[PDB]
């Protein structure tokens with residue numbers, strides 16, 4: 001039901017993907033998304049200490065040097081509060097999701113690509129745990145998930 005999506009390293013992609021590459025990080029959680037998007041004032045304002053407890057998840061913002069907690073707070077604000085109600089179970093799920101990402105599932109399906117001409121590969125910049133229509137992927141080419149070459153848009157290797 002919930003989509004779990006993450007960023008993957010890619011030196012050719014400006015932003016978190018390049019920062020991940022430079023830091024030797026392969027996979028960094030973007031979010032866990034139920035159907036309902038939260039609107040309005042959150043029931044609880046996520047603190048830095050709470051958001052830092054999602055170990056390994058790098059912020060997509062350069063304003064924190066891709067650390068914490070802009071993306072982490074945006075995730076709680078847009079997808080967290082109205083679905084989980086309390087930050088504690090949401091922090092636990094996000095943290096455990098990220099721990100699996102750092103270690104590894106794999107149930108890894110490409111979401112967005114940067115087609116690299118020099119390698120003739122669809123470099124995956126974001127992936128999720130269920131198949132989805134692709135964006136920026138060249139049809140017929142192979143997929144590179146943080147250096148792992150796969151034939152299709154879905155990767156099953158640890």
Ligand SMILES: *[C@@H]1O[C@H](CO)[C@@H](O[C@@H]2O[C@H](CO)[C@@H](O[C@@H]3O[C@H](CO[C@@H]4O[C@H](CO)[C@@H](O)[C@H](O)[C@@H]4O)[C@@H](O)[C@H](O[C@@H]4O[C@H](CO[C@@H]5O[C@H](CO)[C@@H](O)[C@H](O)[C@@H]5O)[C@@H](O)[C@H](O)[C@@H]4O)[C@@H]3O)[C@H](O)[C@H]2NC(C)=O)[C@H](O)[C@H]1NC(C)=O
Pocket residue numbers: 001002032034083084085086087088089090093
């Ligand atoms: C996919 O994403 C969905 C979110 O869309 C997620 O479901 C949510 O899971 C979280 C748990 O991780 C649920 O949060 C709990 O919700 C309770 C209220 O639930 C009610 O029932 C319905 C569920 O079907 C829901 O629709 C209703 O609106 C309704 O509100 C909270 O009670 C709960 O708090 C937890 O307990 C404490 C409450 O206190 C009790 O008393 C004491 C005193 O503190 C406690 O010690 C005791 O243990 C009691 O529980 C809180 O203080 C505490 O922090 C605690 O953690 C918690 O917030 C949420 O309802 C689910 N939402 C929906 C819409 O289903 C799925 O898990 C996701 N699945 C995967 C696989 O990712």
Ligand SMILES: Nc1ccn([C@@H]2O[C@H](CO)[C@@H](O[P@](=O)(S)OC[C@H]3O[C@@H](n4ccc(=O)[nH]c4=O)[C@H](O)[C@@H]3O)[C@H]2O)c(=O)n1
Pocket residue numbers: 007015016029030059060061062070071074125126
């Ligand atoms: N005030 C701010 C500042 C930063 N941020 C977050 O940090 C990113 C960089 O500014 C934003 O990208 P976002 O704006 S969502 O997207 C811009 C670009 O980044 C991409 N992106 C965004 C988030 C993420 O996790 N991974 C990722 O590739 C997105 O696809 C697009 O190409 C947000 O995720 C925010 O939420 N609010």
Ligand SMILES: *[C@@H]1O[C@H](CO)[C@@H](O[C@@H]2O[C@H](CO)[C@@H](O)[C@H](O)[C@H]2NC(C)=O)[C@H](O)[C@H]1NC(C)=O
Pocket residue numbers: 093096097100105
């Ligand atoms: C993190 O990874 C583990 C290993 O895949 C997941 O645990 C398995 O989950 C399935 C279904 O829920 C079950 O068959 C087993 O009980 C678990 N197996 C082992 C070996 O632990 C776990 O669900 C993952 N957590 C998150 C948040 O994704």
Ligand SMILES: *[C@@H]1O[C@H](CO)[C@@H](O[C@@H]2O[C@H](CO)[C@@H](O)[C@H](O)[C@H]2NC(C)=O)[C@H](O)[C@H]1NC(C)=O
Pocket residue numbers: 053055056091092095096099
């Ligand atoms: C979040 O997940 C991390 C793993 O990235 C947890 O760190 C573990 O902490 C325990 C102590 O409780 C250590 O014994 C384990 O070996 C840890 N693993 C690593 C890699 O550090 C952390 O406990 C979790 N935090 C929350 C709030 O759930």
Ligand SMILES: *[C@@H]1O[C@H](CO)[C@@H](O)[C@H](O)[C@H]1NC(C)=O
Pocket residue numbers: 011012
């Ligand atoms: C990473 O990207 C920059 C391009 O902005 C480049 O100058 C550098 O050579 C790259 N490093 C590798 C290992 O590809």
Ligand SMILES: *[C@@H]1O[C@H](CO)[C@@H](O)[C@H](O)[C@H]1NC(C)=O
Pocket residue numbers: 023065
């Ligand atoms: C960003 O963080 C990295 C890695 O921890 C460090 O190498 C770099 O100097 C930082 N950049 C700034 C501008 O502080």
Ligand SMILES: *[C@@H]1O[C@H](CO)[C@@H](O)[C@H](O)[C@H]1NC(C)=O
Pocket residue numbers: 024025026102146147148
């Ligand atoms: C990241 O990905 C490569 C390709 O599978 C792997 O060989 C390397 O050990 C990984 N780095 C981390 C930090 O897990």
